[PDB]
Design a protein around this ligand. Structure first.
Ligand SMILES: OC[C@H]1O[C@@H](O[C@@H]2[C@@H](O)[C@H](O[C@@H]3[C@@H](O)[C@H](O[C@@H]4[C@@H](O)[C@H](O[C@@H]5[C@@H](O)[C@H](O[C@@H]6[C@@H](O)[C@H](O)O[C@H](CO)[C@H]6O)O[C@H](CO)[C@H]5O)O[C@H](CO)[C@H]4O)O[C@H](CO)[C@H]3O)O[C@H](CO)[C@H]2O)[C@H](O)[C@@H](O)[C@@H]1O
Ligand SMILES: OC[C@H]1O[C@@H](O[C@@H]2[C@@H](O)[C@H](O[C@@H]3[C@@H](O)[C@H](O[C@@H]4[C@@H](O)[C@H](O[C@@H]5[C@@H](O)[C@H](O)O[C@H](CO)[C@H]5O)O[C@H](CO)[C@H]4O)O[C@H](CO)[C@H]3O)O[C@H](CO)[C@H]2O)[C@H](O)[C@@H](O)[C@@H]1O
Length: 549
């Protein structure tokens, strides 16, 4: 059999307004995690409700930080939750795999710094001041994601290339660079793309905030927010939100040596899943096939599928909420790494969809890794709300053929919604969409940097594979605020025909598309299909299309 809750383990650090020496304890964790890009250390830093002084929590790799009130101001720092780029000389483009949630910050000089790139979510926060998203010195950065937050002051992206903000409120917005996209953001500036580069939607068509651990006195529980349709502003701002409150004791609590058979036992049983911060090798797919199951990872908990298996398969059921996991490919090629629904998923899940939130996939970088497709999205009405699906461009075990990964995300279900979609470096199509009435709000892609010649990436009569392809027999699709970048470093004479590919049809629509060549390392011929300017020069200027077709 099994057994509910238990021990969060030595990787979940639980503070309150004693705990002696706080700076020192978060100081240590940062020293060991700051440069630790591909290590297997994992940590979640959890703060009980209360007020905390003379704090500055610098957050390194694979560190999550959060509060345990039901609401963010229940846990207040007079002080900072800080990400900077010291370890990389003010270059913030490797500042990955960390997170902040459910805290109020009163930043020591008036502005908190969160200078991150991909897979660094900022959720359910209240900043009582400004928010600077740039490293000190204002060097390179490539984030980013804010949801369900209230920034009393101005957000300053400065050097940030791109950004997505959802269902939030901001006291100001400083600038854009290439693609700043907003949905359901109060204080968002009006649609203006290309100058400034702002894509702005009054509302988010559907959203459902990511589940989180909190304290009910001396009782741990997981708050699980309900669906909001046409979401705008925060879910918490005018007080206690809609949801359901599940005790720790109704979760199976995964520590790094459970098997996929026991994780499974536990699900078949009716227990939810809470992954404690660690790395979990499995020899079978984790299989979630009960409705309303919650599978929540702390401290960037990571699943590695061995033996070429799929890591995670969700059945054809309502309401599964997968949140806060990194899926890291093994050296043996996996056919798929994550599947949501079966091969031909026909029913609906309108009222109670399945979602992936802060689900990150890595192929290579910490050793060789391979997978044919990373995420397959079969079930109708699925919500993909912040994902980074990343074929490693640096680190260990990468190479055009060494960490080969042809396909990033393939969407086959209908009425699927992606908000905050980041997918990079696949050998073939990064994103393919075959289902009907899909919607993407915000896309960031960089193409494979390692392609060795033009022939390698030939797509029939087309040079390259689109970063985002909508199948030709698709009738209805819409995308907002989307960019694809190239940096063909191995062979800069390569040409990429386009960033985007779609049939021409009145029901297929795109808004605010762009492609960019980074320092002239290769060029795009067009933006989408054979439409839009090629990129030219070595000067980093996007080519843009505002409206299509
Ligand atoms: O590393 C692997 C990792 O790589 C990623 O891809 C890399 C990619 O991110 C990188 O792209 C470079 C790109 O970011 C860079 O963008 C610049 C942008 O930084 C610049 O910002 C300016 C600010 O500099 C400026 O600062 C102001 C300052 O001048 C003044 O002193 O003070 C002001 C305050 O008072 C301050 O504001 O502010 C302005 C706005 O006011 C910003 O615009 O802006 C320019 C364009 O305007 C923009 O181009 O450009 C580089 C080239 O020029 C790019 O190279 O490129 C790498 C390649 O070398 C990529 O590898 C991937 O995504 C990850 O998957 C990989 O793992
Ligand atoms: O006390 C509250 C504040 O705490 C901060 O956290 C500290 C943290 O930011 C700091 O990180 C250091 C990095 O900033 C540093 O990175 C270098 C840059 O500083 C530098 O920028 C300069 C720029 O300052 C100057 O004005 O102009 C120069 C050029 O025109 C520009 O270069 O650029 C460097 C690269 O060229 C870059 O390396 O590197 C240090 C060493 O690794 C980091 O230490 O570290 C502190 C250590 O404890 C943190 O406390 C918050 O960020 C603030 O928001 C808080 O208010």
């Amino acid at each position: 059999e099994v057994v509910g809750g238990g021990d969060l383990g030595p990787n979940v650090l639980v503070f309150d307004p004693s705990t002696p020496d706080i700076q020192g304890k978060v100081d240590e964790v940062f020293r060991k995690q700051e440069s630790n890009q591909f290590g297997t250390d994992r940590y979640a830093l959890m703060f009980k409700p209360g007020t905390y002084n003379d704090i500055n929590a610098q957050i390194g790799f694979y560190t999550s930080i959060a509060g345990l009130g039901l609401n963010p101001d229940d846990t207040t720092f007079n002080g900072d939750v800080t990400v900077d780029a010291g370890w990389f000389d003010g270059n913030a483009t490797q500042n990955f795999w960390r997170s902040a949630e459910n805290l109020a910050l009163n930043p020591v000089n008036g502005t908190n710094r969160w200078a991150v790139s991909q897979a660094a979510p900022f959720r359910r926060m209240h900043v009582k001041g400004g928010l600077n998203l740039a490293p000190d010195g204002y060097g390179w950065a490539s984030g980013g994601y804010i949801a369900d937050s209230k920034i009393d002051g101005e957000v300053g992206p400065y050097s940030q290339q791109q950004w997505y903000t959802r269902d939030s409120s901001v006291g100001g917005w400083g600038n854009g660079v290439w693609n700043m996209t907003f949905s359901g953001v109060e204080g968002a500036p009006a649609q203006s793309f290309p100058e400034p580069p702002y894509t702005t939607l009054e509302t988010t068509p559907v959203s459902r905030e990511k589940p989180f651990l909190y304290l009910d006195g001396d009782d741990y529980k997981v708050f699980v927010p309900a669906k909001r349709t046409n979401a705008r502003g925060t879910s918490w701002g005018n007080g206690t939100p809609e949801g359901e409150s599940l005790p720790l004791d109704q979760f199976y609590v995964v520590k790094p040596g459970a098997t996929a058979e026991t994780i499974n036992a536990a699900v078949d049983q009716g227990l939810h899943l809470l992954f404690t911060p660690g790395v979990y090798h499995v020899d079978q797919p984790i299989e979630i096939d009960r409705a309303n199951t919650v599978a929540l990872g702390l401290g960037l908990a990571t699943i590695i599928p061995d033996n070429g298996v799929t890591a995670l398969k969700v059945g054809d059921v309502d309401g599964v909420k997968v949140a806060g996991l990194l899926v890291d490919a093994g050296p043996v090629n996996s056919e798929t790494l994550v599947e949501v629904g079966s091969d031909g998923a026909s029913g609906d899940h309108a009222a109670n969809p399945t979602s992936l939130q802060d689900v990150f996939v890595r192929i290579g970088g910490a050793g060789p890794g391979k997978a044919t497709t990373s995420i397959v999205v079969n079930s109708n009405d699925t919500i993909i709300d912040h994902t980074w699906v990343w074929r490693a461009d640096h680190g260990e075990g990468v190479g055009w053929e060494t960490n080969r990964a042809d396909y990033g995300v393939h969407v086959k279900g209908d009425n699927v919604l992606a908000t905050g979609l980041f997918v990079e470096h696949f050998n073939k199509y990064d994103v393919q969409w075959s289902g009907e009435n899909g919607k993407t709000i915000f896309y960031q892609n960089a193409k494979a940097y390692d392609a060795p010649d033009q022939a390698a990436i030939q797509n029939g009569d087309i040079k390259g594979y689109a970063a985002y392809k909508v199948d030709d027999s698709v009738t209805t699709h819409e995308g907002w605020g989307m960019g694809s970048y190239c940096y063909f470093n191995v062979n800069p004479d390569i040409r990429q025909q386009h960033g985007f590919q779609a049939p021409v049809k009145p029901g297929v629509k795109f808004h605010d598309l762009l492609v960019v060549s980074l320092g002239g390392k290769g060029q795009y011929e067009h933006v989408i299909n054979d439409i839009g300017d090629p990129t030219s020069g070595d000067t980093t200027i996007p080519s843009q299309v505002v409206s299509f077709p």
